[PDB]
Write a protein that binds this ligand. Sequence first.
Ligand SMILES: Nc1ncnc2c1ncn2[C@@H]1O[C@H](COP(=O)(O)OP(=O)(O)OP(=O)(O)O)[C@@H](O)[C@H]1O
Ligand SMILES: Nc1ncnc2c1ncn2[C@@H]1O[C@H](COP(=O)(O)OP(=O)(O)OP(=O)(O)O)[C@@H](O)[C@H]1O
Lengths: 54, 42, 54, 319, 319
Amino acid sequence: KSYTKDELTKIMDRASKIEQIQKLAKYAISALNYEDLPTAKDELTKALDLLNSI
Amino acid sequence: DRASKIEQIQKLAKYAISALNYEDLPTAKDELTKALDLLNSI
Amino acid sequence: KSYTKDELTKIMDRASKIEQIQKLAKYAISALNYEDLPTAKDELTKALDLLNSI
Amino acid sequence: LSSAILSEKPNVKWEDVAGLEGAKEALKEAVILPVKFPHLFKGNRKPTSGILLYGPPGTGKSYLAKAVATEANSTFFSVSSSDLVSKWMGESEKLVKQLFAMARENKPSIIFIDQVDALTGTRGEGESEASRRIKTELLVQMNGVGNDSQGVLVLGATNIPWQLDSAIRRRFERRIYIPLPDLAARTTMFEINVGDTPCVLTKEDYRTLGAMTEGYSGSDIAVVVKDALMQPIRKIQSATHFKDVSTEDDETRKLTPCSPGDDGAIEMSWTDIEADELKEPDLTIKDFLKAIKSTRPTVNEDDLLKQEQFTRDFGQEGN
Amino acid sequence: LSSAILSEKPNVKWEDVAGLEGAKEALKEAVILPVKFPHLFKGNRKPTSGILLYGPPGTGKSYLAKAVATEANSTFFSVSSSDLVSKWMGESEKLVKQLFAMARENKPSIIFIDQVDALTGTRGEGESEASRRIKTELLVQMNGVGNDSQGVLVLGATNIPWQLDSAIRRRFERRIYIPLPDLAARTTMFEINVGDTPCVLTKEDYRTLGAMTEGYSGSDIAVVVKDALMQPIRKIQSATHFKDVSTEDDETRKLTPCSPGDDGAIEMSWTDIEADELKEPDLTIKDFLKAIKSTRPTVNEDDLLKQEQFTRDFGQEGN
Ligand SMILES: Nc1ncnc2c1ncn2[C@@H]1O[C@H](COP(=O)(O)OP(=O)(O)OP(=O)(O)O)[C@@H](O)[C@H]1O
Ligand SMILES: Nc1ncnc2c1ncn2[C@@H]1O[C@H](COP(=O)(O)OP(=O)(O)OP(=O)(O)O)[C@@H](O)[C@H]1O
């Protein structure tokens, strides 16, 4: 199925990045729940940068 | 001015997360961008 | 307020100096309890000179 | 004067144990063949009985014990050496004799002792004198089991064979190494773990994830599987937008969580959706990829080395 | 015979725990969600049985245990590893078995064992006899009911994961690493520890602090907070001179300690002033600066090396 070892490892790598972005988003959400604007901004920005790189 | 906008930001973030969970990258991008712009507008 | 950042360390430094002065004063008090004028007056001199440098 | 020590009906078939067919064969010869055709053991081919399962933890030794117990239809007695060590201040070993008596009364029978190494050695504070006589008792019972006609089987289990008292080893018969599962055994175990769950495409994946898990145990597989299973549940937990799957031919409209970019995407919480009308996401390879991600290599190689050593030194010769 | 462990708990909420919402999710999904919707776990998807909490001390593992205990609202049992060992040298297992029975009695139960490494390893004396047999019994119990039908969750705690017996390791599910708190978490802890005292300028100060605080624990943070909270008391104790705060809206006079040059600076002792009519100084950032200065980092770097080794080897792990 289009290289079941190598391409799938790349896919997994991308998923790990995506997972990290999700985690960042969660962090941002928690920060906002405590009205911690600059930290939320940071976390969102870092997520979006990785999105833009992807 | 500051409460419902935060709620909306949170909602957008949630949407983005859902999108990412289903590998919908452009939706994620647009939702995070809207969240960020809205955050800047506060 | 605009809120400084690098001045916090300097504020901490000034507090350290003030702390030192307070320590000197305490030692002077201690030395005056047993009527050791020379000790107390050297310590007070030190405190005053450094506060004049502050 | 009974004092009942665990007996029960597990429901683990031969086929639920994936791999180790050589041992399985050996065990069918160790238990079932003797019972079916006893007259085959006249002469210098002998009813072997004391059998050790040894190797790393997590490899279904206990699971195998359940399987033969399900399969052999012979009374399976299952015990820790910890159990019934003493009451006093005086009297032990009577319970041991009673256990041996009851097993002789319940032929064909099987004693399973997990972690046989728990009884070993020459230390003080009890082991020099008090548990020495327990040890001795054991040794004399297992001496007498080989005497006359046997219907009792002893199965040993240990992770640390090198900590197993030698005197036992000298009295004891057949030893079988239980290795970590190989490519095939891993693959099959995956397929076993799927069962009713939507199976995605072909065997290629099962073989791939088989290959990609190297050195992991049955347990290590199972946890990963459970994680993957929980992944669609996670996908439901994080939910705004859902969408209908099933057409009007079915009993009712059936809804699954989706991205905001979807067409016909209705937004609510998972809690808002009724249980039947909810459509769980299918199991994709990515769920398993993440399940791999949640399991870092589980292998302490020193243990493997030690098992190799033991394997080379004891087990080849009868002892 | 029973040896009573209490299960009624205080009110520590999820929101009192800063960070690792994924571990929180795992707790909820292992406990609350199963109880909520049991039909989720029909067929081949089955609830978690074991979770190890590990890392440096002071990180709210115990705090987390209290939080889960608050939130789960089911029989939460919690025990020291030392607790319930023996009396007459070898009578140990009765209480163990009875305890596992007690877990069975009130499903869905939760067992928390603190410092699981205290009942672990191998050398002799205890790991020849008593701690041996006890470890063994533990092992038999933990997977005994765990696989197939279960109503217990086992939570372990350890600061020294690398000393955890391999066998126990393979018997146990889900490792969760507790890293030291990050900027956000520390900030949140500061906000939690605001109290009634007027919070000088905004939360920006807490963000600053959170940034300033590097490598510290929950405990450390709490202590520094306490330290800062004593500073106004200290100031009060130091002053002779106090001054009236009370505007015309107040009923009686209200006095705060001040410098000798102050307008209305009266110089009696703090002991002479009544509790209501005394006005403690508010908390400024300088008190927190002082607090920081006083309490040096508590954490040696050399533990984190072994913790990080474990993290690379096992880490965010199923097992
Ligand atoms: N076919 C299989 N092979 C190996 N393990 C399996 C299999 N099916 C399920 N398992 C898993 O193996 C575990 C059963 O215990 P197991 O027999 O592996 O312990 P053990 O190898 O006897 O270890 P120890 O000697 O330390 O008790 C369960 O956690 C179960 O999920
Ligand atoms: N939100 C929080 N996060 C982490 N720790 C907290 C939090 N709130 C309070 N604490 C602190 O947690 C401590 C309780 O012990 P704690 O649970 O940290 O120990 P532990 O993490 O179990 O590890 P060990 O037992 O090895 O110290 C208290 O000193 C308390 O100040």
